[PDB]
Amino acid sequence: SGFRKMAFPSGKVEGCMVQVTCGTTTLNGLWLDDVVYCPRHVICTSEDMFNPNYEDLLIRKSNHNFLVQAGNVQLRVIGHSMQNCVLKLKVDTANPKTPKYKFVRIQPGQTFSVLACYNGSPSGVYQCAMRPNFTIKGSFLNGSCGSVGFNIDYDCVSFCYMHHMAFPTGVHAGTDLEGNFYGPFVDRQTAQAAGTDTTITVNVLAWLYAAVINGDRWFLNRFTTTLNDFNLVAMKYNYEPLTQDHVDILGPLSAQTGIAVLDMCASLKELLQNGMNGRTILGSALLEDEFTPFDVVRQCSGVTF
Amino acid sequence: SGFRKMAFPSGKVEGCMVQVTCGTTTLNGLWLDDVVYCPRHVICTSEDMFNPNYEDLLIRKSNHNFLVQAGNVQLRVIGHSMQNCVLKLKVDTANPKTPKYKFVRIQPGQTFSVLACYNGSPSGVYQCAMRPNFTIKGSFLNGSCGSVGFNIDYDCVSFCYMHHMAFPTGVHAGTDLEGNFYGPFVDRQTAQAAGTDTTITVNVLAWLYAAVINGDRWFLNRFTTTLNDFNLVAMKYNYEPLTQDHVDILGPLSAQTGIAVLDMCASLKELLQNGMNGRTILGSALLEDEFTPFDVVRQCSGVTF
Numbered sequence: 001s002g003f004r005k006m007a008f009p010s011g012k013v014e015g016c017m018v019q020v021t022c023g024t025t026t027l028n029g030l031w032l033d034d035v036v037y038c039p040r041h042v043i044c045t046s047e048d049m050f051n052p053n054y055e056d057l058l059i060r061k062s063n064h065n066f067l068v069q070a071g072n073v074q075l076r077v078i079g080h081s082m083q084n085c086v087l088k089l090k091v092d093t094a095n096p097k098t099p100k101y102k103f104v105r106i107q108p109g110q111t112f113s114v115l116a117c118y119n120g121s122p123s124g125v126y127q128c129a130m131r132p133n134f135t136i137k138g139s140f141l142n143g144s145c146g147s148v149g150f151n152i153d154y155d156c157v158s159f160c161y162m163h164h165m166a167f168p169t170g171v172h173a174g175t176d177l178e179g180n181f182y183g184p185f186v187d188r189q190t191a192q193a194a195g196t197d198t199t200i201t202v203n204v205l206a207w208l209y210a211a212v213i214n215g216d217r218w219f220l221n222r223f224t225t226t227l228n229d230f231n232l233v234a235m236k237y238n239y240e241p242l243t244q245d246h247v248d249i250l251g252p253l254s255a256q257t258g259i260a261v262l263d264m265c266a267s268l269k270e271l272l273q274n275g276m277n278g279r280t281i282l283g284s285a286l287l288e289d290e291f292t293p294f295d296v297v298r299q300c301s302g303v304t305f
Numbered sequence: 306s307g308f309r310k311m312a313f314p315s316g317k318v319e320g321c322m323v324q325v326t327c328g329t330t331t332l333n334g335l336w337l338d339d340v341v342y343c344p345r346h347v348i349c350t351s352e353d354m355f356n357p358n359y360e361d362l363l364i365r366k367s368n369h370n371f372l373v374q375a376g377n378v379q380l381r382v383i384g385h386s387m388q389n390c391v392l393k394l395k396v397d398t399a400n401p402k403t404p405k406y407k408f409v410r411i412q413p414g415q416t417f418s419v420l421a422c423y424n425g426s427p428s429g430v431y432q433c434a435m436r437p438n439f440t441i442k443g444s445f446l447n448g449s450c451g452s453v454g455f456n457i458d459y460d461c462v463s464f465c466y467m468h469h470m471a472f473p474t475g476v477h478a479g480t481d482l483e484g485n486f487y488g489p490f491v492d493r494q495t496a497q498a499a500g501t502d503t504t505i506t507v508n509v510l511a512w513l514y515a516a517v518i519n520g521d522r523w524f525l526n527r528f529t530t531t532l533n534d535f536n537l538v539a540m541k542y543n544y545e546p547l548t549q550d551h552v553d554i555l556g557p558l559s560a561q562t563g564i565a566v567l568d569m570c571a572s573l574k575e576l577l578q579n580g581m582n583g584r585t586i587l588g589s590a591l592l593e594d595e596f597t598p599f600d601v602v603r604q605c606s607g608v609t610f
């Protein structure tokens with residue numbers, strides 16, 4: 001009953017957040033076993049940001065130049081190394097609150113929860129989608145770098161995002177936990193254009209299925225379409241093409257609700273061509289594309305962790 | 306940079322969630338010190354729901370009739386008592402993860418985070434507002450009763466909501482943790498009309514201030530209004546009257562942005578009378594009223610817990 005943008009419970013990730021200070025810069029790190037993972041630009045100065053030689057800057061630094069605090073406890077650094085755009089700080093204490101975890105590189109269209117942190121301390125949690133242009137629309141202030149994004153599956157935390165930078169228009173960019181950026185961005189203060197974003201078609205369809213499950217049906221029309229004729233309209237409206245793999249992924253939702261995927265497409269096609277005409281869908285006046293099919297099923301069947 | 310509906314980190318509340326079983330019914334409870342708090346209708350049968358004598362039903366029950374599980378650990382019940390619509394189960398073990406906490410009865414217009422739980426296990430977290438008609442728009446399935454809503458202030462969890470029931474239209478109702486319902490509802494399966502809801506004016510104004518802080522200014526007009534002429538338009542549009550206490554509460558936001566509260570009102574008045582004309586505000590096509598002034602300041606100044 002009801003449908004909300006829902007984040008994963010954040011307690012397993014809260015117990016892993018730490019503060020990392022090198023010189024004047026303080027940001028957040030992720031403490032798993034005896035390793036702290038943080039963005040490498042913590043070793044930069046204000047004037048290094050425009051073109052840092054990260055490898056050279058790291059030469060200057062010794063283990064003791066890294067202050068790592070977990071709450072009020074200082075963690076002794078005993079090894080440091082770079083992996084892509086992330087720093088790995090080996091510490092002499094293993095995090096006793098380490099959950100079962102994996103590092104995963106997510107694909108565009110997938111969603112995850114963000115635990116926004118400042119000074120090693122969690123501020124809030126919200127749900128984000130990795131946009132087709134490899135950005136995310138989050139809420140991050142100065143000092144938020146090192147905040148992570150994650151999914152939970154029973155007991156396993158799958159970390160998929162670490163925050164590195166913000167751009168004009170509330171656009172945020174980051175890396176996986178192996179340090180590789182999503183999309184063509186660098187941890188450098190230079191002109192960096194995010195590509196044009198598009199709407200995640202399969203997530204819109206998922207959210208329409210969620211509307212029917214929850215009672216909204218005014219938009220269900222009397223038509224059907226082929227896959228090809230739908231992707232002609234999607235491209236005109238800056239929607240991702242719908243692939244057969246997407247059709248298969250909506251399968252279980254189609255079976256629950258009795259609406260074949262291509263009938264939902266016909267209903268979507270008319271929403272894009274005529275608009276909503278003042279009406280709302282699940283309390284929204286815009287088509288929502290930040291729910292995956294799996295997000296819908298979770299919320300609607302009550303999957304716990 | 307960016308603005309999102311943001312929940313509090315839920316880890317302090319996760320460590321308090323337990324499963325309570327009496328007979329066939331299982332729901333969630335909140336374990337603080339040596340006490341478990343849960344909705345009293347856990348002692349009901351399917352046919353008792355229409356008109357339960359809760360006091361009489363509780364006579365039948367003994368301490369051992371209550372199964373309380375925290376994860377895989379069974380907690381021994383050693384005392385039971387009713388307080389309004391909540392049950393208090395004294396247990397022989399004190400929750401070692403009890404945070405600093407208070408029980409608070411919130412006022413309409415205030416927001417809080419909900420930790421939706423099933424079988425004592427957290428499923429997700431999201432942010433809700435207590436509507437003027439004393440309902441909330443959440444996402445709750447069968448088995449969600451006992452899930453709680455809360456705010457966090459530095460280290461203190463202020464519990465303000467416990468979930469008891471759902472009504473047609475994704476409308477949800479519950480109690481404070483002293484067991485008293487918000488609004489005129491009873492824990493009975495009978496016809497129960499929620500009053501007409503209205504829009505929380507002061508939260509809309511807060512969210513407009515958040516838009517200006519974040520860069521959206523197209524809606525700022527060249528006009529001002531008095532308090533009285535604004536409340537004439539608000540009432541026509543099902544908006545709560547704006548009180549001087551609300552004007553004072555928006556004070557700090559007005560000072561940050563340089564927009565006097567009554568100028569924002571003039572800008573709001575024109576949005577209500579002409580609509581948005583296809584435009585969006587902070588990525589929304591509807592005026593949003595589930596951010597308090599304090600929610601805006603938190604998100605925009607980076608308050609941590």
Ligand SMILES: *[C@H](O)[C@H](C[C@H](C)C(=O)NC)NC(=O)[C@H](CC1CC1)NC(=O)c1cc2c(OC)cccc2[nH]1
Nearest residue numbers: 140141142143144145164165166187188189190191
């Ligand atoms: C890390 O705390 C910080 C997070 C930012 C502040 C956030 O989410 N809101 C501010 N990251 C940060 O400042 C980046 C620095 C490391 C990558 C080197 N830089 C930026 O985020 C940044 C650079 C630019 C820019 O360069 C030109 C133009 C416009 C905006 C911008 N933002």
Ligand SMILES: *[C@H](O)[C@H](C[C@H](C)C(=O)NC)NC(=O)[C@H](CC1CC1)NC(=O)c1cc2c(OC)cccc2[nH]1
Nearest residue numbers: 445446447448449450469470471492493494495496
């Ligand atoms: C507790 O798990 C459960 C939560 C519900 C199911 C939820 O959030 N989605 C289902 N609470 C529950 O079922 C309530 C029982 C205790 C108060 C006695 N009852 C209802 O929620 C309820 C009663 C009615 C009704 O009576 C007439 C008409 C329409 C809807 C309704 N819902």
